[PDB]
Amino acid sequence: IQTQQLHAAMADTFLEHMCRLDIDSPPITARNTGIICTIGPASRSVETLKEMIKSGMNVARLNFSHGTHEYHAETIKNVRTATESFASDPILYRPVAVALDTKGPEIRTGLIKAEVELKKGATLKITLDNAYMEKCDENILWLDYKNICKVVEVGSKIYVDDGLISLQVDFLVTEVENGGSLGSKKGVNLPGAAVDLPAVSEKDIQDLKFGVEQDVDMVFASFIRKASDVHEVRKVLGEKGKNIKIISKIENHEGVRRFDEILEASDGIMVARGDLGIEIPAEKVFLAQKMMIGRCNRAGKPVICATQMLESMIKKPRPTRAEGSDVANAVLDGADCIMLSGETAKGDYPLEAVRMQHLIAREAEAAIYHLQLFEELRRLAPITSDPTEATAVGAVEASFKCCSGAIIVLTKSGRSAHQVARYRPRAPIIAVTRNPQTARQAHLYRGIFPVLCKDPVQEAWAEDVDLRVNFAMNVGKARGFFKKGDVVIVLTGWRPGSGFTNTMRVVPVP
Amino acid sequence: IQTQQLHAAMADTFLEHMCRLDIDSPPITARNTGIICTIGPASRSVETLKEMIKSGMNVARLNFSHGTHEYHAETIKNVRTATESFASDPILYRPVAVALDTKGPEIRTGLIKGSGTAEVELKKGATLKITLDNAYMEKCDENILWLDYKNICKVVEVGSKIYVDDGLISLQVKQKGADFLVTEVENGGSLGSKKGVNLPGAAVDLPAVSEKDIQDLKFGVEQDVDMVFASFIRKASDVHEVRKVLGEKGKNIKIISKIENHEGVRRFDEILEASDGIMVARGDLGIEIPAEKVFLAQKMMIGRCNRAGKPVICATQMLESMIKKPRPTRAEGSDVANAVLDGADCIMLSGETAKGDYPLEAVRMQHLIAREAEAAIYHLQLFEELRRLAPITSDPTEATAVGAVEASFKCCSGAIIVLTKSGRSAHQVARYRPRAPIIAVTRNPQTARQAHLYRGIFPVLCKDPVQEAWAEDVDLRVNFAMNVGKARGFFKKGDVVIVLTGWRPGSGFTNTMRVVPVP
Amino acid sequence: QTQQLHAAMADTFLEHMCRLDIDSPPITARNTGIICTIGPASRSVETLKEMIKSGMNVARLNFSHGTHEYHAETIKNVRTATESFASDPILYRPVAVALDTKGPEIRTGLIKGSGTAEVELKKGATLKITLDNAYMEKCDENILWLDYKNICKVVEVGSKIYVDDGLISLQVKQKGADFLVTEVENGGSLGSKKGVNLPGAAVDLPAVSEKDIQDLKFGVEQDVDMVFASFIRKASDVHEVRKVLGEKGKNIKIISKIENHEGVRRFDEILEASDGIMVARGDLGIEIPAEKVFLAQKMMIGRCNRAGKPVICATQMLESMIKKPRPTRAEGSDVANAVLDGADCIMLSGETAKGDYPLEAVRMQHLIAREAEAAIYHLQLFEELRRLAPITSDPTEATAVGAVEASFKCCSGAIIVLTKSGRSAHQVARYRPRAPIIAVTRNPQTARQAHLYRGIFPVLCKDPVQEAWAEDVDLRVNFAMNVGKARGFFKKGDVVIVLTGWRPGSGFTNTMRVVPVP
Ligand SMILES: O=c1cc(Cn2cnc3ccccc32)nc2ccccn12
Numbered sequence A: 001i002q003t004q005q006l007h008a009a010m011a012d013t014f015l016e017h018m019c020r021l022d023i024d025s026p027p028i029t030a031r032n033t034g035i036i037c038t039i040g041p042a043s044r045s046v047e048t049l050k051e052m053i054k055s056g057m058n059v060a061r062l063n064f065s066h067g068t069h070e071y072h073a074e075t076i077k078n079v080r081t082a083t084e085s086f087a088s089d090p091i092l093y094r095p096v097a098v099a100l101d102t103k104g105p106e107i108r109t110g111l112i113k114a115e116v117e118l119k120k121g122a123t124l125k126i127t128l129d130n131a132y133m134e135k136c137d138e139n140i141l142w143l144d145y146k147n148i149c150k151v152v153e154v155g156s157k158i159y160v161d162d163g164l165i166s167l168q169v170d171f172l173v174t175e176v177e178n179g180g181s182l183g184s185k186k187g188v189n190l191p192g193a194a195v196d197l198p199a200v201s202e203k204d205i206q207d208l209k210f211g212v213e214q215d216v217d218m219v220f221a222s223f224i225r226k227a228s229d230v231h232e233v234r235k236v237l238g239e240k241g242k243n244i245k246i247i248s249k250i251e252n253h254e255g256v257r258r259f260d261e262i263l264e265a266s267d268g269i270m271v272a273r274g275d276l277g278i279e280i281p282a283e284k285v286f287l288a289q290k291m292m293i294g295r296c297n298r299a300g301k302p303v304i305c306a307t308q309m310l311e312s313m314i315k316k317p318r319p320t321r322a323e324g325s326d327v328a329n330a331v332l333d334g335a336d337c338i339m340l341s342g343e344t345a346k347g348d349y350p351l352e353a354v355r356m357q358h359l360i361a362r363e364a365e366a367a368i369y370h371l372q373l374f375e376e377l378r379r380l381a382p383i384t385s386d387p388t389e390a391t392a393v394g395a396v397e398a399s400f401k402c403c404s405g406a407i408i409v410l411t412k413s414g415r416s417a418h419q420v421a422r423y424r425p426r427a428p429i430i431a432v433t434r435n436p437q438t439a440r441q442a443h444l445y446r447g448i449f450p451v452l453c454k455d456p457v458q459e460a461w462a463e464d465v466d467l468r469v470n471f472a473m474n475v476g477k478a479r480g481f482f483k484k485g486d487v488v489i490v491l492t493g494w495r496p497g498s499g500f501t502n503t504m505r506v507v508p509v510p
Numbered sequence B: 001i002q003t004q005q006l007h008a009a010m011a012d013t014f015l016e017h018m019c020r021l022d023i024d025s026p027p028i029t030a031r032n033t034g035i036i037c038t039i040g041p042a043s044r045s046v047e048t049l050k051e052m053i054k055s056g057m058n059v060a061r062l063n064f065s066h067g068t069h070e071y072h073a074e075t076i077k078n079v080r081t082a083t084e085s086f087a088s089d090p091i092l093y094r095p096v097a098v099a100l101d102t103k104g105p106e107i108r109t110g111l112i113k114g115s116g117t118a119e120v121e122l123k124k125g126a127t128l129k130i131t132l133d134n135a136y137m138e139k140c141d142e143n144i145l146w147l148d149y150k151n152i153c154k155v156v157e158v159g160s161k162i163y164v165d166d167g168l169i170s171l172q173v174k175q176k177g178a179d180f181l182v183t184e185v186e187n188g189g190s191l192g193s194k195k196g197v198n199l200p201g202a203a204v205d206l207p208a209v210s211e212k213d214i215q216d217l218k219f220g221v222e223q224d225v226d227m228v229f230a231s232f233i234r235k236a237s238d239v240h241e242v243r244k245v246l247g248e249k250g251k252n253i254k255i256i257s258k259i260e261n262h263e264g265v266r267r268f269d270e271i272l273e274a275s276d277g278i279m280v281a282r283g284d285l286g287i288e289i290p291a292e293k294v295f296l297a298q299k300m301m302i303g304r305c306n307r308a309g310k311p312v313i314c315a316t317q318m319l320e321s322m323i324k325k326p327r328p329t330r331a332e333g334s335d336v337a338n339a340v341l342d343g344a345d346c347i348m349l350s351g352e353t354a355k356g357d358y359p360l361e362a363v364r365m366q367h368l369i370a371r372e373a374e375a376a377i378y379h380l381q382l383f384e385e386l387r388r389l390a391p392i393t394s395d396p397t398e399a400t401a402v403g404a405v406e407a408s409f410k411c412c413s414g415a416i417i418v419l420t421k422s423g424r425s426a427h428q429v430a431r432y433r434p435r436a437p438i439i440a441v442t443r444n445p446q447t448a449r450q451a452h453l454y455r456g457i458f459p460v461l462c463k464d465p466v467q468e469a470w471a472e473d474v475d476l477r478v479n480f481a482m483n484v485g486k487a488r489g490f491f492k493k494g495d496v497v498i499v500l501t502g503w504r505p506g507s508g509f510t511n512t513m514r515v516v517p518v519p
Numbered sequence C: 001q002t003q004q005l006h007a008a009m010a011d012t013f014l015e016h017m018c019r020l021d022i023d024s025p026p027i028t029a030r031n032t033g034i035i036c037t038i039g040p041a042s043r044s045v046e047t048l049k050e051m052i053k054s055g056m057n058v059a060r061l062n063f064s065h066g067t068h069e070y071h072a073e074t075i076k077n078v079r080t081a082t083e084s085f086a087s088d089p090i091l092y093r094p095v096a097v098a099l100d101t102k103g104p105e106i107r108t109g110l111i112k113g114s115g116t117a118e119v120e121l122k123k124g125a126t127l128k129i130t131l132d133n134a135y136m137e138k139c140d141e142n143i144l145w146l147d148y149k150n151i152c153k154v155v156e157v158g159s160k161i162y163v164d165d166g167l168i169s170l171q172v173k174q175k176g177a178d179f180l181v182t183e184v185e186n187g188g189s190l191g192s193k194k195g196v197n198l199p200g201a202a203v204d205l206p207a208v209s210e211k212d213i214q215d216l217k218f219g220v221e222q223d224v225d226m227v228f229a230s231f232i233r234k235a236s237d238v239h240e241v242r243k244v245l246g247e248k249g250k251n252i253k254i255i256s257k258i259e260n261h262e263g264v265r266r267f268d269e270i271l272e273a274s275d276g277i278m279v280a281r282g283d284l285g286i287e288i289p290a291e292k293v294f295l296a297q298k299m300m301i302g303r304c305n306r307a308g309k310p311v312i313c314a315t316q317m318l319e320s321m322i323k324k325p326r327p328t329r330a331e332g333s334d335v336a337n338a339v340l341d342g343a344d345c346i347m348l349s350g351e352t353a354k355g356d357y358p359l360e361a362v363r364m365q366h367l368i369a370r371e372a373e374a375a376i377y378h379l380q381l382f383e384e385l386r387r388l389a390p391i392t393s394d395p396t397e398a399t400a401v402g403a404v405e406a407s408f409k410c411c412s413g414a415i416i417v418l419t420k421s422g423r424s425a426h427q428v429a430r431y432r433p434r435a436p437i438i439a440v441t442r443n444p445q446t447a448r449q450a451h452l453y454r455g456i457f458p459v460l461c462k463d464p465v466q467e468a469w470a471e472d473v474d475l476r477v478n479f480a481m482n483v484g485k486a487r488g489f490f491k492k493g494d495v496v497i498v499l500t501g502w503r504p505g506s507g508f509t510n511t512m513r514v515v516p517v518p
């Protein structure tokens, strides 16, 4: 009772559950929320990447907004070098995924003449004549988006340089709402506009093909506005990249409004709060965040909460109180993963930022009101004929009933473990696979602790099944998830191959 | 249904309620969560203060860790000048409370090279000597660090961790002494003048109410402050000590206990029972206990305060980046919204308003987020849990209060108008957390100021003289609240409001609830 | 410790049941309306006086038998007995009068010219049904006449015909022009003028017959409070009853009796058209399989509670009490479960109309209802009623829920409501408070009709209108404090909820006061 917030777990109301949250109730070792770190000058080396892994990084994120293919290939090579330095012990080997975050379509201003000053309620004309592209000034500004006039109307706002400058409407004349240092080749945002820019730009096609060649596990597809955008990303990945997960980045009003069709078309979602906070009033981000996490939990699809989670840690070795809170509340909301950008890419304390996310995520997971969450997940999920779905909900129920140390799932593609994860058990889900890509991808789903079996396939299938379950038991005992004599849930299928999980057993730890 | 997250309000589950939160669903005009602003050099002028009031500032906080009595007396004077500049129209006047935040049992360093602005870059693994010899109190550098805690050597042992400046710098006690400590820099950084020192493992024996606190509390009574935010409250006896120090002259001053250490969290229940309200003082609390556990202590304290109907304040680094930037980080927007969703009565600004470059933008942002987050609350579960967890009582006032809240949800009322002398009647309504704002009409200026501590209370100060016929005096205050609500856009003619009154004059007779249309 | 308050606290319905305590005694107040059928056993002014002391609230008159002259004398006896208590207005109890229509009944003739003669019908035997009026007073074990002329047209070979509360069942073997050769499936004693059911048949009889029209017009003339309309199959049948009552009987409550398949299938349209429902289990249990009646009952009680319209549970609730002074366990359970289901009223037919223990049956209904009312899981019920209730702009609906909420919070002795038309008290009753609703009115029809709503205890104020309106309000509130104190619903110092309006007349209820009992 005095550990894992188990007194708070027993509350009959959410109010009382909150009243019982105890700073003296220590959490277990298992940390269920996946940690995604953006790699950069502060974290690119092998030595550092080894420490990143030890501190808790599960996914290495490569930002293709900048850098060449050569640079990115070397980052990937470094990640795999640091990752396989741990391969010698398969019991302790932690798989590490590689994510490719696309540049995506963007609106950029021209070259000035370099800085200029804009003020109060002055005038500035927006032109598209590619003769003014080299002569940007205080009275006239050129843009690379030719359909800007079609998507904007009388009273529409234009945001310049990550929202620093505000403006009001073959050309458009604007009245400055908020001035400042007008730079050259700066990003432009169109709030409320149904931007008709390509789903995937020319550079993105090249990047996505590079990703297939580099054997990446997932793509974080930028500026996803509709279902067709996801379909274009999927078509570019083709047959060679059919198994690569697609996470759609919701960055503007359109993406939020057309969310249900994007979720159905995608493998998962990223709440890209940075871009979203420029596109929608910042006081509304928390709404879009809580709506997307809720709907992803409802569909059983992975959701990533991103941007400025521990921002002050770029310069400081400890985060602010708002940051500590933001990480906890993203876990409490129901986010599968939490992300680090500048904090691991450019900052002075990358390792400390990763360690803090791990500590907060672990305390937040014990703090979840599983009693309400599990009843609501059950009530909202459809009654289907699927044997694996019934098995998965059965296992979660059994794990709550006997307070099991884990739910051991045998999986080839990962699907069987994903089905367990959508019911959010408190027990860690040990997914035993032989597929190295599945083990990497499994980090996207809350609760899943992926373990790669390297043992050779036995000829008697029932013995091969037993070998993989025993492996999971060994990983559990070694990492102190449970010990000999404890009860665990074990999920297996009625024959080899995917799609047959239908067997739930309550097994003592040997 | 398309406004105030009413589609989300209708959800049968919390998960579905979250699924329905809509960025395109605009909130009402009224903002329920009170905004406390620390007043410092960036916000002291009458000019700025008038604009703070307009931006949404409800309480002016005075941090007695710094500044002389003369400085604070002038800040208070300027707060009153800005507030009274709006008194010509009683319909548009907004009361503004004055809060005195004590220094308390603080441990502080001296001056780096005799300058209150100079800094030293401390290196990891480096040796630093801590002295109590006042010869170095202005001669601090990268080798010698003076602090004002005379009994440091007794309560600290070898291996003990010493945190400096919001715990950003860390040190380990390597060799103990009589008035000195030989330390090893565990975590480096830039060390400035007069920084905060924490000793999480140590049994700090500093008095509850210091000699400086007694002088400041006295000045608070003389200055007619509305509340005291008492630093480092550890047990109920500490609250009792503040209460006894304020004595008879300060008996109506509200005491808010600041929980910022492990003992305070541990002995929370007895502290709460003794206090008029609580501050979740996350700054120190996040140094004293592991920073990852702060959200647990925060939600336990908000829940327990909500369960007890006593005000709770969420404080520190809520919009921190805004000291230097005109826009907050996404983590900051989140924190503000989540403090409101948790059930915090008030939210607070420190350096963001006291010394930052954008104090009005920080006030405006807290106002914008709070109002958005108030509509996002799951009132269906919150009101059911508040009802079930509250005892059955013979108190007529409590029954009227819950009946009034029930009526306000049924007709989606524009407000709950409450006539109150002490504030109690409006406090009893706030406890049940209605969606509609509570317009508290009072003739007592202190009540009007102190009501800002409670979620939803929109206090109004009636200046109209007392009429011969009591029933006409009652109707005059109700009409005054009708006038305020219309003028501020909380409602318009024909809308329905709830009205709370008593059956005779004086406090304690609230027993009448009326459902009336707006004239 | 009292009125199942320990079970009231339960966080789950399962634990609510676990905590039900036979040693937790109920309050004095009984909220469920008791409807009694008047007959030879209960017609005397002297018996009617005792029926009123036992707890009868509504006197039901079955217009399937008797003449207008006979029914007018019944109504006179009910009024004489009710008005005997008017000497003390504190103890006076309003009593309503309900007219129950004959509707499209199908009845057999006389057994060998006698009203009491019986024949033994044996299983396997042939029975000939005739429409020939030469046999209307010559029924026996071989021939049986019935008054439904178009019986042959609506039935077929193989069809089943039920006689006498469905105790005798016949199977049609041969169909004819004005006859039916049948076989005895369920035998027994066949008596005179027994009711007939044709479960599968499309009975074409009118919803409102000429006799029904006369009875309905007589209802208006006799100033009845409500009508119980038999065999209502659709909305158009209720509109037919409504039309007949017309402007003169516009304020007479229509309670549609659901006693057939079509009535259940069309229930929503029926309920929208009506002022209330009777779950008419007798004929319903013959018209549809008997094992489905509880389903229909719970569906109808639920939908009426959801619509805020009165619902009556009727027929064979304490049947064995016709011949015995105590009921069976099933009968005790049935009365308890109708109250638990949410029925506003419970009814007695044979038990009060012709049985040997009428006063006993009324007393028993009173004792069970009171026990069952304390057993209600108010915590879930109030939460569900609020959730399923729409958000209104109506100040009166907001004041009513506020008052119910306030009554739960302080566990008040009562919710005192001042009402002209009764609407304000009905709005309080739709939220099911635990506290009894003392509805103070000066309108006598309002006071009588208030018995149709769970929890309403109507009191008729005799006192003339005081000059100052506030004083007239206070006089009526004090009258309720006096009724509640005399009936032992509360004592001095207890807390009660008071509901009034801001000006005289109907529709201004907007004031809720929490006041100590003087
Ligand atoms: O009733 C509540 C209230 C809250 C606080 N909260 C956190 N995001 C919120 C979004 C909207 C409303 C309240 C919100 N969280 C939970 C969690 C589980 C069950 C019930 N909950």
Ligand SMILES: O=c1cc(Cn2cnc3ccccc32)nc2ccccn12
Pocket: C013, C017, C340, C341, C375, C376, C377, C380, C381
């Ligand atoms: O809230 C209720 C009320 C009732 C009716 N009922 C039947 N025995 C009862 C005993 C006491 C109170 C109500 C009772 N049944 C259920 C069934 C499932 C869930 C909730 N229920």
Ligand SMILES: O=P(O)(O)OC[C@H]1O[C@](O)(COP(=O)(O)O)[C@@H](O)[C@@H]1O
Pocket: A410, A411, A412, A413, A414, A415, A416, A417, A491, A492, A493, A494, A495, A496, A497, A498, A499, A500, A501
């Ligand atoms: O989650 P997935 O990809 O459907 O895989 C689960 C599969 O794994 C198994 O447990 C074992 O299959 P293999 O022996 O082919 O690995 C199957 O019985 C089951 O259908």
Ligand SMILES: O=P(O)(O)OC[C@H]1O[C@](O)(COP(=O)(O)O)[C@@H](O)[C@@H]1O
Pocket: B419, B420, B421, B422, B423, B424, B425, B426, B473, B500, B501, B502, B503, B504, B505, B506, B507, B508, B509, B510
């Ligand atoms: O909240 P409090 O301090 O009890 O004050 C509420 C009081 O205000 C009133 O409505 C009006 O009283 P006054 O006329 O004395 O101000 C009382 O009837 C009621 O008891």
Ligand SMILES: O=P(O)(O)OC[C@H]1O[C@](O)(COP(=O)(O)O)[C@@H](O)[C@@H]1O
Pocket: C418, C419, C420, C421, C422, C423, C424, C425, C472, C499, C500, C501, C502, C503, C504, C505, C506, C507, C508, C509
């Ligand atoms: O229930 P109804 O028919 O709306 O009547 C309730 C009415 O009774 C009153 O309390 C008293 O009215 P009277 O003084 O006219 O009898 C009104 O203020 C209120 O509107």
